Amino acid sequence: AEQTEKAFLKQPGVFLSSKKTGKGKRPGKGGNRYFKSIGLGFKTPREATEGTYIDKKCPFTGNVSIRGRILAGTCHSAKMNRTIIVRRNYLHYVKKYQRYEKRHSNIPAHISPCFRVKEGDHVTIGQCRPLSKTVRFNVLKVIPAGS
Amino acid sequence: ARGLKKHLKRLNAPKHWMLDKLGGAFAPKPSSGPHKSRECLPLVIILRNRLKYALTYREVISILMQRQVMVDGKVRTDKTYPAGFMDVVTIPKTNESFRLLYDTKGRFRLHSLRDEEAKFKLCKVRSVQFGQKGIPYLNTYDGRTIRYPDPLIKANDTIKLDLDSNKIVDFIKFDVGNVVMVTGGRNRGRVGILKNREKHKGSFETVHIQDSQGHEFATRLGNVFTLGKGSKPWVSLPKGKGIKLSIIEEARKRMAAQSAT
Amino acid sequence: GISRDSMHKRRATGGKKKSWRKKRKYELGRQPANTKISSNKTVRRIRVRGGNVKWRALRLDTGNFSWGSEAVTRKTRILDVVYNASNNELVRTQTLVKSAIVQVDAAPFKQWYLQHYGIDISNHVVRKIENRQADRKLDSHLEEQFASGRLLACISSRPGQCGRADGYILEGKELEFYMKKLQK
Amino acid sequence: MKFNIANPTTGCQKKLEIDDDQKLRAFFDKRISQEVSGDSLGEEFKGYVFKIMGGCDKQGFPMKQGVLTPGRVRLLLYRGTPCFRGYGRRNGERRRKSVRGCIVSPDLSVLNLVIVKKGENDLPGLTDTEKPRMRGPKRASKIRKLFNLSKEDDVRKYVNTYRRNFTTKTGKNASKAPKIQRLVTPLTLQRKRARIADKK
RNA sequence: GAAACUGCGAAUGGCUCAUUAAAUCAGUUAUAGUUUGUUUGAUGGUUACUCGGAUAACCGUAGUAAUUCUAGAGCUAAUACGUGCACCCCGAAAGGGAUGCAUUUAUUAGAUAGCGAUGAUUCAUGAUAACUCGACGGAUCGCACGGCCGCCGGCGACGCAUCAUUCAAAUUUCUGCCCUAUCAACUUUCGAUGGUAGGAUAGUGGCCUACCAUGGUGGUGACGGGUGACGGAGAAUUAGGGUUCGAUUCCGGAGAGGGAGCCUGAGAAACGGCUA
Ligand SMILES: [K+]
Ligand SMILES: [K+]
Ligand SMILES: [K+]
Ligand SMILES: [K+]
Ligand SMILES: [K+]
Ligand SMILES: [K+]
Ligand SMILES: [K+]
Ligand SMILES: [Mg+2]
Ligand SMILES: [Mg+2]
Ligand SMILES: [Mg+2]
Ligand SMILES: [Mg+2]
Ligand SMILES: [Mg+2]
Ligand SMILES: [Mg+2]
Ligand SMILES: [Mg+2]
Ligand SMILES: [Mg+2]
Ligand SMILES: [Mg+2]
Ligand SMILES: [Mg+2]
Ligand SMILES: [Mg+2]
Ligand SMILES: [Mg+2]
Ligand SMILES: [Mg+2]
Ligand SMILES: [Mg+2]
Ligand SMILES: [Mg+2]
Ligand SMILES: [Mg+2]
Ligand SMILES: [Mg+2]
Ligand SMILES: [Mg+2]
Ligand SMILES: [Mg+2]
Ligand SMILES: [Mg+2]
């Protein structure tokens, strides 16, 4: 199961030992798995509404809100645990020569288990509160490379 | 800094105060109050620079310490009290009463009022939410809190506030077709009819306003202030009536004035 | 003193950060409470930013614990720390921290259970007690530990912050998870 | 070594200078707040008991209670505590100052003594005349306690007892009495009624 | 009305440019990630005709070469200090428990398309079970005197608590900086990158600890070195493009001989504050 840490992982506020049943109640009530919509026109993946993973940094089932800048880029590194490096490619204008030069920036981003990603896939990231020393973004959508 | 700044350098003061740059090193630092320091007119500016009743900083203190000036019906003795948009300033000895409104060039104008019209003001609703004990309340953009508001009132609406009963007399819902004034930005002081509302999820909402002469300008929702339902404002406007003239048109009037005057 | 600034850290690239200012008071830390289980209760009052107050518990012996399924909360004595997911050294030192698994006295909950269900683990009174006994269900794992007089509980408060050690009684799959960690 | 002898019951005080080491052996090794018999201090002090309150060393540094040494140490003191007056200094400001220990030793330059029990012959200028208190009670409850007044008995009629009369160099007559504090008057009851009225 | 206690302020201003090269800083964001004396608005339950003990000024014994260095004794105040009137459960439906506000935890409601808001929150807020050894819920002051037959009552001042507001800070998103490769690899045992659980913090965060994973950056120049490098608004010269400068009065940052540490406080790692 998802219980792989030393502590028991669960969603905060979802009581799992209630005598009554959760049939007919909203998410997060009656022991039902909690999930939410982040707004801005983004859809909640089926893997997050019907999954069993526990991720307090997940934008759909965790305790983090999306607000600020929405960016897009390509998955550059997917070797960390639930974190990827997103490469953003842009052109910098060199004024004196009236021409452009290619630049890039690597943006660390948290990716919830509901998303599948590989190097080269296109990802959309939304800003959230600091999740670690460098992570300030959460993956909101993944488009497989060549699609 | 290790805390709060108590001084305002004269060149850093808001431009709409129209302070001369060589008048001194400092400008009046607006006190905390209902309006923001960048969107207000301290009483010292009003009494000395606009009305000329006081000739110096010292004389403004004498006037206020005699309890001769009232803002929104209450006596104020703070020289840097931040009087702002729609505030009613009353001076019983001179029998005068003004409303702070923007002229079409974006500067505060002391619009003389009649004794009857000086008994109320307009306020923009900031938000409506439940307070302690589940009691609903609304707060405005002039720092006021009203409990038990009408359930129909929502954010960005305008309420007519009676300065005697201190109660909501009537309100205007924020909707397309009403007459509004711009209270911030490039178009500050312009009056028109709200024609459209463009919402952008997560971003600022833009509102397209059309002047009475067909001139259309946009601005942010935060800079709009509904003045009346339909096309007639609930308050008296200055002579320009929020009509912004081009520099060419303004020069045309000035030329004609010299010929006649 | 203890500081929470990032100036002493390496950059994400790995390069060093040359110091450009001294430590600020608004980024300070403080010594940990290291709350222990002891009958000599001691909570010291700490003045924090804004003139507000924090309560730092050095020693505690009782806590306010809630039986979630029964929706009953009682003050009870803390008996022992049995498991800690962060550091096993906090178990043998009997340190009270949030999310630590502890054993609490079962006596206060037994009294409520007898007063509520009329069971050990006045005409109108017996009318309702039997009525409540129809929908009475007690987990076998939860009942087995009432005989010993101790209930496994999880601390949900932060004793070093609020000065208290409150929690809830373990039950369901959470109880199964931790009792398997203690089965050695 | 000098001695500052004070008589709390009488309000009088006097300085005594003694140079006989054999007579000072009674005080040496004593600590603050400990009592010393005046028999060996002299003949006129027979039957007198003195309490050691403190003193200053030959460099003027004061003795501090609790410093269980005969020498000088440096302590970080708070304002207003003994050995650190801290006048004109910031609130919360601490200072490191030199303080002599609490154990009496020949290194002291003066000792402050309090007569806790008088002997046979009354000392001249210490137990002969009683100096009156400069000021009488000012709080209402203390005036009633002083004169054993009751709840119904008026208190403002007794402050005239210790009213101070005198003549000014430029005038002829002048009397002064204290203002009674915590005195229940019609105005105080009016304030209480108004405060309750506001709540309703 | 001196003095003195109490209160507040002294964290602004002024000065300077040493350190500092994605850092400061600029435009642009975010706080649903926090604190905020004051101002302004609103809001605070159904011995008491008023408690207690101290202390200053003052008074008078002083010490030391000496300092807003200092000891002892006698007095007396408070808006100082310490106190204190001030629906649910059990149940022989009597009686009892809890019953303000705040604090801490848990259960529960917060719909639908009686029932509020958002682009978005188990959010605002409600109810319930308990919890805390809670600087909270006025032992204060001025002026004016009136109306009822002792009762009632006016206009102010100051103060406590909560929310909103204002004044702000802290942290923070995106993009942007001079020369140097005779600097090509750098980071990671002792945090480097990320994960889980805690601790600490006003609060987010390897900020710190335990455990786990092996990541993170780099010819689109990392890392290192140089700067007689604070950044910007701007300044000089300019057909156009450009070159050079920007210590200095506006804004931001930083420092107070060098480091470090800290008290007081709403606010300082303060220096015309303290400790080394
Ligand atoms: K600052
Ligand atoms: K201060
Ligand atoms: K910026
Ligand atoms: K820059
Ligand atoms: K934190
Ligand atoms: K972590
Ligand atoms: K203060
Ligand atoms: Mg300054
Ligand atoms: Mg927003
Ligand atoms: Mg009094
Ligand atoms: Mg003073
Ligand atoms: Mg360098
Ligand atoms: Mg950057
Ligand atoms: Mg809630
Ligand atoms: Mg954490
Ligand atoms: Mg570690
Ligand atoms: Mg430069
Ligand atoms: Mg330099
Ligand atoms: Mg410069
Ligand atoms: Mg220089
Ligand atoms: Mg200069
Ligand atoms: Mg400057
Ligand atoms: Mg500094
Ligand atoms: Mg120097
Ligand atoms: Mg310093
Ligand atoms: Mg100096
Ligand atoms: Mg200074």
C-beta separation of D7 from D116 below 8 A: no
- Dihedral sign, Cα of residue D121, residue D126, residue D132, residue D133: negative
DSSP per position, chain B: --S----EEGGGS-GGG---TTS-SEE--PPSSSS-GGGEEEHHIIIIIIS-S-SSHHHHHHHHHTT--EETTEE---TT-EEETT-EEEEGGGTEEEEEEE-TTS-EEEEE--TTGGGEEEEEEEEEEE-GGG-EEEEETTS-EEES--TT--TT-EEEEETTT-SEEEEE---TTSEEEE-SSTTTT-EEEEEEEE--TTSPPEEEEE-TTS-EEEEEGGGEEEEESTTS-SS---TTTT-PPPHHHHHHHHHHHHHH-
C101-105/C72-83 β-pairing: antiparallel
Distance separating alpha carbons of residues D185 and B86, to the nearest angstrom: 48
State the amino acid at position D88 in one-letter form: G
C20 and C38 co-located in one domain: no
Tell me which residue has tokens 């709009």.
B224
**Domain limits at C176?**
31-106+150-184
Strands B96-102 and B74-75, by their bridges, are: unpaired
Residues D21-55, buried b or exposed e (16+ Cβ, 10 A)? eeebebbeebebeeebebeebeeebeebbbbbebb
In chain B, the residue whose alpha carbon lies closest to the alpha carbon of A126 is B202
Does C12 contact A7 at a Cβ distance shorter than 8 Å? no
b (16+ CB within 10 A) / e for B34-51:
bbebebbbbbbbbbbbeb
Number of domains observed in the structure of chain C: 3
Beta bridge partners of residue D186, listed in sequence order: none
C-beta neighbour count of C123 within 10 angstroms: 5
Q: In this structure, are C9 and C94 located in the same domain?
A: no
Nucleotides of E under 7 A from a protein CB: 5, 10-14, 19-24, 29-33, 35-43, 45, 49-53, 57-66, 68-78, 90-93, 101-112, 116-133, 135, 138, 140-145, 151-156, 162-177, 186-188, 191-211, 213-218, 220, 222-224, 241-243, 249-256, 259-271, 273-276
| Rounded CA–C1' distance between C20 and E261, in angstroms | 19
Distances from the Cα of A107 to the Cα of A65, A135, C139, D184, angstroms: 18, 8, 49, 74
Helices H / strands E in chain C, number of each: 6, 8
CA C43 to chain centre: 16
Hey, are the CB atoms on B202 and A41 less than 8 Å from each other?
A: no
CA–C1' distance B193–E136 (Å)? 51
**Calpha distance C174→C141 (Å, rounded):** 11
Look at the alpha carbons of B96, B97, B101, B107 in this order and tell me if their dihedral is positive or negative: positive
| CA D162, chain centre distance (Å) | 22
- Helical segments of chain C, H only: 89-92, 107-117, 123-133, 140-144, 159-162, 173-181
Cα angle vertex B167, ends B161, B173, to 5°? 55
The residues with which C81 forms a beta bridge, in sequence order, are C102
Per DSSP, the three-state class of A118 is coil
d(CA D81, CA B38): 50
Residue C153's Cβ-side half-sphere holds a number of Cα atoms within 13 Å equal to 35
Range 9-68 of A in CB contact (< 8 A) with B = 39-41, 67
Estimate the crossing angle of helix C123-133 against helix C107-117, to 10 degrees. 110
The SS3 call for residue D185 is: coil
Å from A116 (CA) to E271 (C1')? Answer: 58
Count of positions (residues) in chain D? 200
Q: Which residue of B has its CA nearest to A68?
A: B202
Residues C179 and C96 in one domain: yes
Largest CA distance in chain D: 78
A68: left (phi over 0), alpha (psi -120 to 50) or beta: left
**How far A128 CA lies from chain B's nearest CA (Å)?**
13
Same domain, C66 and C113: no
Among candidates D194, D186, D180, which has minimal Cα distance to D143? D180
> In which element (H, E) is residue C79 found?
strand C72-83
Stated resolution in angstroms: 2.5
Any idea which ligand is nearest the CA of B12?
Answer: 22
**Four-CA torsion C157, C159, C162, C168, nearest 10 degrees:** 20
Method: cryo-EM
**What span, in angstroms and rounded, lies between the C-alpha atoms of B5 and A10?**
48
CB of C60 closer than 8 Å to CB of C98: no
Only one residue has tokens 């009676």, namely B162
Q: H-helix or E-strand containing C78?
A: strand C72-83
Residue A14 in 3-state DSSP?
coil
Closest CA to C58 of C80, C79, C33, C31: C33
**DSSP E strand boundaries for chain D:** 2-7, 12-17, 35-37, 49-57, 72-78, 94-100, 108-117, 164-166, 174-176
The residue written with tokens 């520099």 in the block is B247
By CB neighbour count within 10 A (0-12 exposed, 13-18 middle, 19+ buried), where does D72 fall? middle
Can you tell me whether residue A109 is helix, strand or coil?
A: strand
Strand D2-7 vs strand D108-117: parallel, antiparallel, or unpaired? parallel
| Same-domain pairing of C83 and C172 | yes
Pick the closest to residue D14 from D23, D26, D2 (CA basis).
D2
Ligand nearest to the CA of C12: 13
Domain-wise residue ranges, chain B:
1-116, 121-171, 174-244
Q: Which of A123, A114, A125 is nearest to A147 (CA)?
A: A123
Residue D65 CA, ligand 13 centroid: distance in Å: 60
Shortest CA distance from B199: residue in chain A: A40
* Residue located via tokens 């005969």: D70
The domains of chain A are located at 1-147
What is the DSSP pairing of strand C53-60 with strand C36-37?
parallel
Nucleotide E224's nearest residue (CA vs C1') is C15
Same-domain status, C78 and C121: no
Q: Can you give D59-71 as a three-state secondary structure string? A: CCCEECCCCCCCC
User: Are C56 and C139 found together in one domain?
Assistant: no
CA of D98 to C1' of E2 (A): 35
C35 and C97: one domain?
yes
Nearest nucleotide, CA D87 to C1': E68
